Design a protein around this nucleic acid. Structure first.
Lengths: 136, 63, 386, 61
RNA sequence: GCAGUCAAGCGUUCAUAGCGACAUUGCUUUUUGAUUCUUCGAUGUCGGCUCUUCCUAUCAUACCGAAGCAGAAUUCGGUAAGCGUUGGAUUGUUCACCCACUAAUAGGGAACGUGAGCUGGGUUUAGACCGUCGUGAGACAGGUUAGUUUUACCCUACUGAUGAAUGUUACCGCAAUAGUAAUUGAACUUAGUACGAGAGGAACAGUUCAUUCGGAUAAUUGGUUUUUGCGGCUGUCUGAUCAGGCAUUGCCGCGAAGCUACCAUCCGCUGGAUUAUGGCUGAACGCCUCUAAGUCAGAAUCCAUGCUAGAACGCGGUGAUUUC
RNA sequence: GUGAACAGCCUCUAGUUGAUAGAAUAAUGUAGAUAAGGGAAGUCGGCAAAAUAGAUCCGUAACUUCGGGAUAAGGAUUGGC
């Protein structure tokens, strides 16, 4: 549904609603993101737009080097930390919550990442996969 | 079967079971069931609890 | 005075009234199209909901993005004794409905059907069909002029059948009974098929085979007079509210000065006769056999019974039907098995399944092992014998 | 007098599905009809060819 | 507020693609007036939360027509209300105005729906402060602050539950009818093609998934824990140990069965007749023409196959029918 | 007795077992709880609920009428033998 979902995400159990202070895993400097919306999500009375992996968000930053603040930049999430389920039978869950700013389409503004990366954000975004770390 | 050995208690589970777990050092874990998960993440130690196999590699019962 | 935030509608307008169902069987309410060209077979079935277990599987969706991979998925193995025919009965045509015309019966109905008609048993004299079982003595005009009655007239024909409750371990000892139609052709050889399957046994191999998709229509389980937030799935209130939280608080307006029938209200959940569609049969074994829990890529000699036994059910020593997904109704029901209502080529059914491995773990507790000698072969020896 | 009464099973013996088991009235009715049997023996007759023919209850002060 | 006939004009020269001067005819009460008919021996009056139904004066989706439409983007209409129509900061807000998501964030009605459903922030109470006006008591549609929301067991309506009468009773049933439900998007390929001078840049089938709702299920993860199942601990009590009471269910660790979660999984089918619309044949009107006779295809429309109750006054088939 | 204690918890000496009871575990309730992942996004308003507590050691700002703020904020130890 999202503007740039090259391929498809699968039914991954979504557990990041709007207004979660998730920290980042980048070298841009802005350490925490403030998640705000989901590209192409559901619309029902009094339910929050909840996020999952892969699909980008419009998350602003909250504290960092203060030329990034007070602005809304498209971001992308890599690590969720909620017990989802793959089709492979086994299934992850992390302990942090990743955040990467990548903000015309999903080409990364930073030049490095930190920590592991979920399997599902590999095929859906090619640009992360070229300069990734160890992928799980 | 996809053949599997536990990373906490040495017990066999054939997939569809157990919470595979990761952490910020990119070290993959996988557990046997729910019983080994919450009995781990409150910072216990495997080398001093009886029902695991690694206790019985250490005092050598049943080899 | 409009809605001011416009939302979808709770519940479904094509499942109500949802009252406690008439029969305890599911009512088989629909039948396929009869094919006159293709020969005589049998269409629906009668079964006992026993197992509901994982299975793993090679995916065969070429072009997709999990091609040649493994997937855990719940199989619902519905076990069955081989059914035994007791007679046939054929409806006739009129502009008012499928009116029933005549029945014919076998000559020695067993002791597992004569307790269906008599509601009490021990006080009963057990006189069932005995003035009907005096008709077989003469030259053959006992049946055949009523066979001539069902031959000469009566377009559509059924066959009524009871399951052997003997070889399936539950405490009823009292067989159920239903009807199932005949999908063949040439209405003579329709009943001439049942002219020699009287009182004998027909197993699942006669129609049910590999990759032959079915739908199940069953009787779901109930929990009573459950409230409105769980019946229609509707919304709670804020905590602040006096006089109840698990209710709804605007039924209808002033005029109409009644309640609308569409409003979510409390009452009965479950014990309906609901109906799923488009399941999948993975594999069918055979009855008088041991060690059919094995497959191609496993090779481990083992039975399909999960270790020790089932949960609330027991054992399985019969021929059986894998069914993908979930079928309605809990353990120990009367689920029937209807054929395809329509020839489906949805590019998701009719693709060939090859079971890599089926599981037989310890379903009661948090299960640990699959074959029972392996648990001895893993932890070694114990203080007891074994 | 059977509106809002708790209906039980054993009413289908007699025809309608509402029934209770009164105690302080069945202590007296069969307590008094043995005194009816105590009167017929002063009238010199059987105890098997009888039937209670006319019951009567009413409001009291 | 919405919609028409009329047409000097704009629109590169062309009134009507779109808009429309000066006039002119109406329609709905979604606002405000005017009137005081109905209640002053009392209709619980603002707004918000919960939730059904309806009208289209259509925002999106289906299917078509027109353009100063080459595509893409758009505007203008035609049938249609079946389906959707939000998350937020500020205000008590109706309307107000901004950030963000989207196929879009359309307009309303149902005693200005909804207080024996809530909330009581606004309001007109009784407390208090302040500015203005008065000699004062006080006024102010001026500002701010704290301020009890009562009863259903009656009738009807609804949702479920039973149930006498019929020869008795037990199975097998069949349909009168009544309700009906699935809906939208993304990506790959089509394809950097058609169309384009370029700049840009589609679609139908075909694949894979996703959003909202609905129906079931408990393998699997998670939740739940009085199974007080097991284990540990604090204080006290049984002369100590074991074994246990006593903490409103002592606390803590795990967890069986059970129940449920778009926080878990599976499933949600086709056929006909049609609207707009585009035609064939064909006159009246020798040619002309979708219509007047016939007519062919056609929508998310309607009705059927399907799904659900099965009339306790719709009915059938088949048993067994009290030796005394 | 634990403890700081006349607090909370448990028992002895004295007093009662007095409140209409029996069967079942549906809704809605009254009370008491628990909840993963998000942390106020709900509402007029963090209203209710949750965290925090006890002692012991260290460290502690703006401001001031120098008396206070101040246990400011914030870390660390706690058993049995």
């Amino acid at each position: 549904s999202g503007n740039g979902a090259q391929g498809t995400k699968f039914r991954i159990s979504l557990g990041l609603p709007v207004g979660a202070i998730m920290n980042c895993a980048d070298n841009s400097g802005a350490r925490n993101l403030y998640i705000i919306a989901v590209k192409g999500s559901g619309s029902r009375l009094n339910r929050l737009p909840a996020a999952s992996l892969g699909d980008m968000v419009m998350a602003t930053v909250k504290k960092g080097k203060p030329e990034l603040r007070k602005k809304v930049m498209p971001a992308i999430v890599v690590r969720q930390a909620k017990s989802w389920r793959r089709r492979d039978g086994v299934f992850l869950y992390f302990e942090d919550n990743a955040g990467v700013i990548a903000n015309p389409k999903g080409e990364m503004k930073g030049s490095a990442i930190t920590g592991p990366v979920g399997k599902e954000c590999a095929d859906l975004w090619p640009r992360v996969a070229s300069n990734s770390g160890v992928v799980v | 079967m996809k053949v599997e050995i536990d990373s906490f208690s040495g017990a066999k589970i054939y997939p569809g079971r157990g919470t595979l777990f990761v952490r910020g050092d990119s070290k993959i874990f996988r557990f046997q069931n729910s019983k080994s998960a919450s009995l781990f993440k409150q910072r216990k130690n495997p080398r001093r609890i009886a029902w695991t196999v690694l206790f019985r590699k250490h005092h050598k019962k049943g080899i | 005075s409009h809605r001011k935030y416009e939302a979808p509608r709770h519940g479904h307008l094509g499942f109500l009234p949802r009252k406690r169902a008439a029969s305890i069987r599911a009512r088989v309410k629909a039948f396929p199209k009869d094919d006159r060209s293709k020969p005589v077979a049998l269409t629906s079935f009668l079964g006992y909901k026993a197992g509901m277990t994982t299975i793993v599987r090679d995916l065969d969706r070429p072009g997709s993005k999990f091609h040649k991979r493994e997937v855990v998925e719940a199989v619902t193995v519905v076990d069955t004794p081989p059914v035994v025919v007791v007679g046939v009965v054929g409806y006739v045509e009129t502009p008012r409905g499928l009116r029933s015309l005549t029945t014919v019966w076998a000559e020695h109905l067993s002791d597992e059907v004569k307790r269906r008609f008599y509601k009490n048993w021990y006080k009963s004299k057990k006189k069932a069909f005995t003035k009907y079982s005096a008709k077989y003595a003469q030259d053959g005009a006992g049946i055949e002029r009523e066979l001539a009655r069902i031959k000469k007239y009566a377009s559509v024909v059924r066959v009524l059948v009871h399951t052997q409750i003997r070889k399936t371990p539950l405490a009823q000892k009292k067989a159920h009974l239903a009807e199932i139609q005949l999908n063949g052709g040439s209405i003579s050889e329709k009943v001439d098929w049942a002219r020699e399957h009287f009182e004998k046994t027909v197993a699942v191999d006669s129609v049910f085979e590999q990759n032959e998709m079915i739908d199940a229509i069953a009787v779901t389980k109930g929990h009573g007079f459950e409230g409105v937030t769980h019946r229609w799935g509707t919304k709670k209130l804020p905590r602040k509210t006096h006089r109840g939280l698990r209710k709804v608080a605007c039924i209808g307006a002033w005029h109409p000065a009644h309640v609308m029938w569409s409003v979510a209200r409390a009452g009965q959940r479950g014990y309906h006769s609901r109906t799923s569609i488009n399941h999948k049969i993975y594999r069918v074994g055979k009855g008088d056999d041991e060690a059919n829990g094995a497959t191609s890529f496993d090779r481990t000699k083992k039975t399909i019974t999960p270790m020790g036994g089932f949960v609330h059910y027991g054992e399985i020593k019969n021929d059986f039907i894998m069914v993908k997904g979930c079928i309605p109704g809990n353990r120990k029901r009367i689920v029937t098995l209807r054929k395809s209502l329509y020839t489906n080529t949805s590019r998701k059914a009719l693709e060939e399944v090859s079971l890599k491995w089926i599981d037989t773990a310890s379903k009661f507790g948090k299960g640990r092992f699959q074959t029972p000698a392996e648990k001895h072969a893993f932890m070694g020896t114990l203080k007891k014998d074994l | 007098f059977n509106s809002s009464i708790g209906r039980t099973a054993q009413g289908k013996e007699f025809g309608v599905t509402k029934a209770r088991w009164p105690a302080k009235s069945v202590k007296f009715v069969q307590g008094l009809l043995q005194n009816a049997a105590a009167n017929a023996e002063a009238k010199g007759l059987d105890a098997t060819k009888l039937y209670v023919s006319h019951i009567q209850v009413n409001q009291a002060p």
